[PDB]
Amino acid sequence: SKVLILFGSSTGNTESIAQKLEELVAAGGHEVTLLNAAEASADNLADGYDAVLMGCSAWGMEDLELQDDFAPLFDEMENMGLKGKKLAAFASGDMEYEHYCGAVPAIEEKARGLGAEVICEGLKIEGDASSDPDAVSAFAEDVLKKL
């Protein structure tokens, strides 16, 4: 199954989770593409991928505000061609802030609405991939069984 991993990250935290996910999905025998949202275009983004693992950090306090590079792609998610594709969300956050990993339910709610099949509950972590290695491992195991 060809998997795209799309992330937006300002200090590298969601980026490190995405890199770890690529390593683990790839090792399960999949063709995996790592793409930074900064270099991505939403129109027909999902074409030829069977699964899209998307993730980003949130940057608002009382309101949810997505990471600068992922926020336009989020907005144009209807253009991506997600219908009938398998999808999972991930994010780095900080529990001191309101909307702790707010991008995960927002991406899930929107991808569900667009006809994507969300295959598991999104990963929510504090800090980077090495601060909680078991949850990143466990979530990857989870998407590998569902692919």
Ligand X SMILES: Cc1cc2nc3c(=O)[nH]c(=O)nc-3n(C[C@H](O)[C@H](O)[C@H](O)COP(=O)(O)O)c2cc1C
**Taking a C-beta distance cutoff of 8 angstroms, is the pair 1, 30 a contact?**
yes
The yes or no reply on residue 26 touching ligand X (CB under 6 A) is no
Q: At what angle do helices 13-27 and 133-146 cross, to 10 degrees?
A: 50
Helices vs. strands in the chain: H and E counts, helices first: 4, 6
Query: Any idea what the Cα angle at residue 133 is, between residues 128 and 138, rounded to 5°?
Result: 120
Asked whether position 84 contacts ligand X by CB under 6 A, the answer is: no
Decide if residue 60 touches ligand X (CB under 6 A): yes
Based on the shown chain and the rule CB under 6 A, indicate whether residue 10 belongs to the binding site for ligand X.
yes
Residue 140 is a binding residue for ligand X (CB under 6 A): no
Radius of gyration of the chain (CA): 14
Q: By CB under 6 A, how many residues form the interface with ligand X?
A: 21
* 109 binding ligand X? (CB under 6 A): no
Decide whether 7 or 49 has the Cβ nearer to ligand X: 7
Closest CB to ligand X among residues 135, 147:
135
